[PDB]
Amino acid sequence: MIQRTPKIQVYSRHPAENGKSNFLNCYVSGFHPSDIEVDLLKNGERIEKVEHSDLSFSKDWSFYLLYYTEFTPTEKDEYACRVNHVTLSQPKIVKWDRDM
């Protein structure tokens, strides 16, 4: 049974500007099987009411999803995306970096 572990990108829709409203995205791709758990975190805690795209897949059959939420970035607030998948022995947390 083939398994492919997620690529994970965490990033904003628009270039980040402190105190300015934006969207926080977590894009998970290249994975199989399709069952996955994705949370967006604000200062280590899970943000509620996060939305996601409908399941679709690439030419190599691997899956991709986008998870997203409205956010207003600030100097000090830390954001992240936490991902669990069958391929991971523990959930992976990828920190938001405004330069990536």
Binding site: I2, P15, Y27, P33, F57, L66, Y68, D99, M100
Partner: protein
């Protein structure tokens, strides 16, 4: 230019947790326009782009019937595959199906597709001839024999040459304001000190549509392929896409480094360099 229509389907069994979940989406180029999810409270195919909303009740009614019909055949196929592969009924399995067409600038068929994958592996695919099959293994060969016996490829060929092409043309016209507009990338180069001896130069493309783009770094005009970190092209959430390419550069050598951008929304490829 050239354009494509695709429908994507995925069924995932979940023994002990009800019937397989079925999700299908349709795209024209990189624009989602319809969706159906069997776990939705009252499942119907729903519009996801404004230009399809004008389609009438007969349209929506037939699309929803098809979605439900395909969901059911996927469920039966998933049972069949446990037999073909001598598998337990205990585990979760995945069936994926894609089909659609590619058309040129004049709208004529370039290529049609209809292909299936079980548990992330190729199962059976319609060949480019639209008349013959590639079966991945002796299991798929059983399906091939049945489908050859029922002349299934002829039926798909007729669709792919006919309705697929004709309705893609229709959608391209109805959604001309967006589907026929390329948004070029907004591009810039950033510099990120790593140590006293090197820094990262990151070449950004933002806000572009469609998704296809080439971002390259050269050093003294030699491509830096093996040395460039290229992130996957990623959706911004507003229809547009983003991408970046980065190189690690010895301090003082930044001007030997040029970023090259090709997008269909650009008249000429761009050349960028870091500007302190």
């Amino acid at each position: 230019g050239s354009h494509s229509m695709r429908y994507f389907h995925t069924s995932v069994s979940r023994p002990g947790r009800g019937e397989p979940r079925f999700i299908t989406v349709g795209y024209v180029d990189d624009t989602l326009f319809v969706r159906f999810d069997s776990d939705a409270a009252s499942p119907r195919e729903e519009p996801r782009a404004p230009w399809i909303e004008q389609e009438g009740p007969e349209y929506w009614d037939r699309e929803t019937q098809i979605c439900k019909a395909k969901a059911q055949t996927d469920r039966e196929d998933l049972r069949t595959l446990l037999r073909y592969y001598n598998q337990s009924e205990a585990g979760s399995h995945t069936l994926q199906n894609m089909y659609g067409c590619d058309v040129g600038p004049d709208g004529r068929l370039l290529r049609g597709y209809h292909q299936d994958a079980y548990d992330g592996k190729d199962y059976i695919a319609l060949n480019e001839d639209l008349s013959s099959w590639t079966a991945a293994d002796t299991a798929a060969q059983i399906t091939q024999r049945k489908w050859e016996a029922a002349r299934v490829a002829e039926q798909l060929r007729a669709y792919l040459e006919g309705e697929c092409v004709e309705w893609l043309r229709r959608y391209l016209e109805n959604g001309k304001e967006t589907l026929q507009r390329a948004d070029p990338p907004k591009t810039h180069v950033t510099h990120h000190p790593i140590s006293d001896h090197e820094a990262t130069l990151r070449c950004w493309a933002l806000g572009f549509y469609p998704a296809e783009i080439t971002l390259t770094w050269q050093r003294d005009g030699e491509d830096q392929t093996q040395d460039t970190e290229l992130v996957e092209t990623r959706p911004a959430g507003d229809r547009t896409f983003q991408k970046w390419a980065a190189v690690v550069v010895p301090s003082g050598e930044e001007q030997r480094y040029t970023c090259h951008v090709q997008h269909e929304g650009l008249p000429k490829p761009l050349t960028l360099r870091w500007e302190p």
